[PDB]
């Protein structure tokens, strides 16, 4: 009875969605001028990681960036001068994520040890210290984004996102709903909501305060590897193993556009938006990042400079540059 | 001021000095992924390396080995297995005595072999629990032909090395299982990576040299590939 009733609400929800699709972003933006040909060039190549870079993050200052590598090292670089400010040796060599605090005082990371370790950079002593270890996840830690100096949100391979309190190290809110490994997180600009992409071809919008799944987005055919909010926080983009990127609207609750080409048959590892949101930077497994016109689905450009799989992307807060990590152990900066 | 510029450049030189010391240790150490199942007996192989994720360190001939057992994860491994694309070898441990779950081990080996990120990582296959397999065959209460009908028209290969006082049925059974894995290994693996089958039990005073010898062979063949010789 519930099996038929489950599809009753899905059909009713889908029916309500069709009542709001009077046009498409493809045909609305049919008349806008294209962005041209985005020709970014490697302005900086950061060397020093022995093994592949799994993730990196930008500081709010748009100059200091942190990168993680599968050799137990958390290097904090100076992008302007190519200088290693810190190089934090981790207990676990298998680290899949890293986050730089908005205040810059802390850095977090974790991976296959199921722990989001918090590192203190502004210690009164010479070197850094491990501030706190977060234990409580029952699978590999895939993402972790700081909210404040004391709140961090972590997405794990145990199909669970958790909101922590670094003061006590306990899990305050637990976000459950995904039936697959949660691989990516993105925080809204206001940090009141965060969107989450899992290995079940679905993305969920979570309320941080309420702790409940506000909306669920489907459209993708395979595992969503990457997710990123739009700058204005009313949309997000996802990248999956089906060699496609999709842009979803929060308010309309429908997929607005798809970023696919016939030549593209490799998964998207990372997505990012330029400061304006007009360019969607997507890293592929074909070793090069494509620049997508986010209002026309046209391939504006290509960042072909990496020898292995492109792991992570990031656009700076001020939008100066794009950092692009890869499995070749080199973090390059494009402008 | 310009005082910070030289201090910043000095701290980078100190950082880089430590990174050179770490790079020597990192390149000198071989990382192995230990795979297997509940009944495989990976633990017993770990117990033999007395010389979220469980790390083992053993030393053979003054070479450091790091074996990783990823025990703290769910049954879905398609995302975290991409972490171990840079390891020297995958230690694949199979319970050769359990024919019911043998096809799962064949399918797991085939997915590993054919993965886009593990298609250059040689597999050291350990066909564990040879003691249990030997006693299982002579009992006769369980037949391999029930689970693998191709066992009916299979004969022991010429290049077989039975142990002294070994029943021929055990040698045919134990080589058929080895050949099932080598059918997958040879179908897609062309010079990029190789399988290294072994037979082992819980009582083996060995498998630390076996991994060391097979890792030496993996490193040798990597060099000969660069020279375009192999």
């Amino acid at each position: 009875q519930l099996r038929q009733e489950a599809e009753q609400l899905k059909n009713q929800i889908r029916d309500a969605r069709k009542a709001c699709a009077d046009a498409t972003l493809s045909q609305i933006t049919n008349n806008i001028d294209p962005v041209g040909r985005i020709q970014m060039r490697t302005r900086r190549t950061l060397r020093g990681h022995l093994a592949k870079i799994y993730a990196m993050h930008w500081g709010t200052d748009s100059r200091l960036l942190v990168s993680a590598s599968q050799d137990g090292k958390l290097i904090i670089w100076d992008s302007y001068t190519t200088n290693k400010v810190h190089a934090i040796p981790l207990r676990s060599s298998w680290v899949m994520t890293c986050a730089y605090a908005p205040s810059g005082n802390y850095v977090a990371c974790g991976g296959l040890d199921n722990i989001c370790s918090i590192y203190n950079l502004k210690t009164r002593e010479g070197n850094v210290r491990v501030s706190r270890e977060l234990a409580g996840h029952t699978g590999y830690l895939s993402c972790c984004r700081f909210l404040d100096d004391n709140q961090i949100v972590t997405s794990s391979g145990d199909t669970t996102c958790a909101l922590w309190d670094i003061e006590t190290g306990q899990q305050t809110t637990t976000f459950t709903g995904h039936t697959g490994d949660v691989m990516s997180l993105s925080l809204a600009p206001d940090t009141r909501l965060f969107v989450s992409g899992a290995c079940d071809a679905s993305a969920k919008l979570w309320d941080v305060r309420e702790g409940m799944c506000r909306q669920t987005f489907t459209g993708h055919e395979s595992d969503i590897n990457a997710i990123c909010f739009f700058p204005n926080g009313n949309a997000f983009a996802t990248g999956s193993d089906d060699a496609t990127c999709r842009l979803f609207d929060l308010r309309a609750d429908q997929e607005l556009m798809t970023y696919s080409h016939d030549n593209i048959i490799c998964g998207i590892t990372s997505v990012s938006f330029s400061k304006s949101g007009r360019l969607l930077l997507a890293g592929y497994d074909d070793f090069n990042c494509n620049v997508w016109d986010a209002l026309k689905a046209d391939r504006a450009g290509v960042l072909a400079g990496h020898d292995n799989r492109v792991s992570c992307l990031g656009v700076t807060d001020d939008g100066m540059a794009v950092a692009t990590g890869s499995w070749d152990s080199f973090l390059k900066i494009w402008n | 001021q310009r005082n910070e510029e030289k201090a910043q450049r000095e701290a980078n030189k100190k950082i880089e000095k430590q990174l050179q010391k770490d790079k020597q240790v990192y390149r000198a150490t071989h990382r192995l992924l230990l795979l297997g199942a509940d009944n495989s007996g990976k633990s017993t192989i770990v117990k033999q390396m007395r010389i979220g994720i469980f790390e083992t360190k053993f030393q053979v001939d003054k070479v450091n080995f790091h074996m990783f057992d990823v025990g703290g994860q769910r049954d879905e491994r398609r995302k975290w297995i991409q972490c171990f694309n840079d390891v020297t070898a995958i230690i694949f441990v199979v319970d050769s005595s359990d024919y019911n779950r043998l096809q799962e081990a064949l399918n797991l080996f085939k997915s590993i072999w054919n993965n886009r990120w593990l298609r250059t990582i040689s597999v050291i296959l350990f066909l564990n629990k040879q003691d249990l397999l030997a006693e299982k065959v002579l009992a006769g209460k369980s037949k391999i032909e029930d689970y693998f009908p191709e066992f009916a028209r299979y004969t022991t290969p010429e290049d077989a090395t039975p142990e002294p006082g070994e029943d021929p049925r055990v040698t045919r059974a134990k080589y058929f299982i080895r050949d099932e894995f080598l059918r997958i290994s040879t179908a897609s693996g062309d010079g990029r990576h190789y399988c290294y089958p072994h037979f082992t039990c819980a009582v083996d005073t060995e498998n630390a040299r076996r991994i060391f010898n097979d890792c030496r062979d993996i490193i040798q063949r990597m060099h000969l590939r660069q020279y375009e010789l192999l």
Epitope: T159, G180, D200, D223, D241, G267 | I81
Partner: nanobody
């Protein structure tokens, strides 16, 4: 939305012929390697058979070799498992599984406890 609905299966005598159709939707059928997985009552999930994108390559578990025939129809987006000589040991719930990635020779996690790209399944109860 990725959906895999299976039809057929139910009560049948030993040695009977039974056909399962898996209607796949919400993805490009022709790109993915398909699979068949069964779960015997009070037992773990077991892999039965797989078919490639085109149908050139086929595999079987060994217990169903020479009795089960797997065919795909790219045109109708359907997956088939033709049963010929059933046994009382074949009673299980048959799920039609799909490879996670769209152009790959490897099926990872198809027989997992909570795999996402599997159908609800059809009970195939075979008895006298």
């Amino acid at each position: 939305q990725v959906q895999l609905q299976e039809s057929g299966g139910g009560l049948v005598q030993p040695g009977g012929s039974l056909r399962l159709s898996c209607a796949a939707s919400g993805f490009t059928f022709s790109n993915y390697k398909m699979n068949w997985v069964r779960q015997a009552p009070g037992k773990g999930l077991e892999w039965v058979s797989d078919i490639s994108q085109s149908g050139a390559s086929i595999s079987y578990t060994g217990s169903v070799k020479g009795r089960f025939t797997i065919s795909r129809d790219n045109a109708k987006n359907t997956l088939y498992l033709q049963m010929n000589s059933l046994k009382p040991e074949d009673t299980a719930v048959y799920y039609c599984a799909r490879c996670p990635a769209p152009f790959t020779r490897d099926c990872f996690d198809v027989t997992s406890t909570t795999y996402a790209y599997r159908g609800q399944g059809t009970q195939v109860t075979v008895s006298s």
